[PDB]
């Protein structure tokens, strides 16, 4: 769903026409879409650098990459990079849509089930998503970093 | 508010808290205004009770209907005496700051009582609401907020 599609749905289930508050919501979305698109472009620029900096901030040189940790095996390191790239990409989609429903529908659906099945540590994942959020808020600026951090904190809060 | 604070610190093993001592200090500071409100309600006993009861009979004519409970001069005199009792308990609660005098004199077993008397509970409650409206019109404004909120406890606890 969108913010546009959410506004249209909320006006639809009442049978209501588009009143002035919904037009205010759509015009606010059409105002913010500029920096939304620019932020999505520069996040699509260097996603690999963001994931590299995030694991170098949070996960590297810990016991997690040591033997016994969950990132010791090299296929598990590759799976870690894959999961962080997923979090960043779906946070980019939720930032450009302006509605976190795609995070609820595509990422946060059965994810705690999987992470408790595999024995994946949840708190280290939350700290890695936090480091992702700090790196991309530094990279994109504060004004779009707020909206990026909202959906990354949404993923972090639903994960916990 | 001293009895409730003491029994609450009695349930724990510890003394009275600094917060609770601030509560007692603020209650002492507002106590003189509460005595003024009790002075006004004591001296307006007659007309408040009569206006509230007649507002009740304007709203609810079922009690003074001949199938109702308050049919006749003696029954309606006991009706006004019940409203007098509840206004007296409201003045006690305004003075004490607790609602434990209101509760353990007139709230705690009133449903079973008025069930056995044949009297409807909701009409008692509407009469105490009429008392709340009348005493709200008599007093000063945020003073009436103070009086009407104890009245509000009595009204919500009767139903």
């Amino acid at each position: 769903q969108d913010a546009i599609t959410a506004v249209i749905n909320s006006a639809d289930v009442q049978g209501k026409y588009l009143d002035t508050a919904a037009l205010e919501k759509l015009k606010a979305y059409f105002s913010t879409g500029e920096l939304r698109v620019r932020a999505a472009t520069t996040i699509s620029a260097n996603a690999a650098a963001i994931v590299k900096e995030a694991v170098a901030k949070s996960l590297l040189y810990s016991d997690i990459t040591r033997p016994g940790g969950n990132m010791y095996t090299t296929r598990r390191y590759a799976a870690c990079i894959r999961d962080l790239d997923y979090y960043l990409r779906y946070a980019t989609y939720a930032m450009l849509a302006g509605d976190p429903s795609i995070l609820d529908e595509r990422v946060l659906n059965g994810l705690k089930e999987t992470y408790n099945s595999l024995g994946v540590p949840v708190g280290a994942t939350v700290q890695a998503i936090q480091a992702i959020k700090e790196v991309t808020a530094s990279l994109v600026g504060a004004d779009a970093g707020k909206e990026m951090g909202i959906y990354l904190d949404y993923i972090s809060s639903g994960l916990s | 508010i001293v009895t409730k604070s003491i029994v609450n610190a009695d349930a724990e093993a510890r003394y009275l808290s600094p917060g609770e001592l601030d509560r007692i200090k603020s209650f002492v500071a507002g106590g003189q205004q509460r005595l003024r409100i009790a002075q006004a309600l004591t001296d307006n006993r007659e007309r408040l009770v009569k206006q509230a009861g007649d507002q009740l009979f304007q709203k609810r004519p079922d009690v003074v209907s001949p199938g109702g409970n308050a049919y006749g001069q003696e029954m309606t005199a006991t009706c006004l005496r019940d409203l007098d009792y509840y206004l007296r308990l409201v003045t006690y609660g305004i003075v004490a700051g607790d609602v434990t005098p209101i509760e353990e004199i007139g709230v705690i077993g009133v449903r079973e009582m008025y069930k056995s008397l044949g009297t409807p509970i909701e009409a008692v409650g509407e009469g105490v609401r009429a008392l709340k409206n009348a005493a709200s019109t008599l007093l000063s404004a945020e003073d009436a907020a103070e009086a009407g909120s104890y009245f509000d406890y009595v009204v919500g606890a009767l139903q």
Binding site: - | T3, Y92, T100, P101, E104, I105
Partner: protein
């Protein structure tokens, strides 16, 4: 507020090889609220009540217990 009770309750079930000497003969302090149903339990078990005494409370107290 607190009653000082003293009652005996015999055993009308099968006989027990442990005492229940605290349970047959006892003296305990019961609060005023629980005392009605606790008395009613001794009323049910067919036991005699020997001694009832108000420990804390005063009679005829309308407020503050």
């Amino acid at each position: 507020r607190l009653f000082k009770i003293t009652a005996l309750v015999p055993s009308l079930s099968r006989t027990r090889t442990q005492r229940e000497l605290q349970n047959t003969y006892f003296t305990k302090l019961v609060p005023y609220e629980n005392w009605f149903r606790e008395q009613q339990r001794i009323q049910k078990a067919g036991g005699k009540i020997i001694k009832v005494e108000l420990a804390t409370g005063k009679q005829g107290t309308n407020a503050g217990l």
